[PDB]
Amino acid sequence: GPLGSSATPREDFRVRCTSKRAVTEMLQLCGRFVQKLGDALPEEIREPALRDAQWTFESAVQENISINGQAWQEAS
Amino acid sequence: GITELSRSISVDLAESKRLGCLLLSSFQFSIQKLEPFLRDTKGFSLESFRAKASSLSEELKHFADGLETDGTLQKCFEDSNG
């Protein structure tokens, strides 16, 4: 109880995850909702806009989590 | 920059709940970067795009609740591996 020093308040606000594969599978499931946007998109830009939206979606999640305290691109 | 998303999610919430929130914020984030590039061509009004996008945001929030109770989100925080 009294032994040891106390931890300093939280400074890394990224979601602390452990499994890179499990996050990837979660993103695959949620990717269906990005695809449903194609209905409201015009055929002129639909395909590149959906690729862009999907990649923006996955990037925002990946850059806001840590994999065992490490960044996404540097973990396994 | 882009790390504002997780900085804006309360740390008083369980980390699995924060991941569910992050899923929705990221979805809304990708919506907002795409919207300025949409114009009112015939058959595709920006009004109808916002209706579809906000409808999907609420379905995603329900979907994430389901992932929170069926263990799928929890798998992101488990390890029994090398």
Residue in A13, A49, A57 closest to B26 by CB: A57
**Nearest CB partner across the interface for B77, out of A10, A18, A57:** A18
> What does the block give as tokens for A13?
């606000």
Q: In this complex, do A29 and B67 lie within 8 Å of one another by their Cβ atoms?
A: yes
Experimental method: X-ray
Q: Is A60 on the interface with B (CB under 8 A)?
A: yes
Cross-chain CB nearest to B5 (options A19, A22, A64): A64
Q: Report the number of distinct structural domains present in chain B.
A: 1
Q: Using CA atoms, how far apart are residues A40 and A44, in angstroms rounded to an integer?
A: 12
Q: Provide the residue range defining the domain that includes B73.
A: 1-82
| Burial class, A11, CB count within 10 angstroms (exposed 0-12 / middle 13-18 / buried 19+) | exposed
* Full DSSP string of chain B: -TTHHHHTS-TTS-HHHHHHHHHHHHHHHHHHHHGGG----TT--HHHHHHHHHHHHHHHHHHHHHHHHSSTTGGGG-----
Q: How far apart are CA B11 and CA B9, in angstroms?
A: 6
Total CB pairs under 8 A between chain A and B:
118
Q: State whether B29 and A64 contact (CB < 8 Å).
A: no
Contact B76 A18 (CB under 8 A): yes
The residues spanned by each domain of chain A are 1-76
Within 10 A of B63 (CB to CB), how many other CB atoms are there? 19
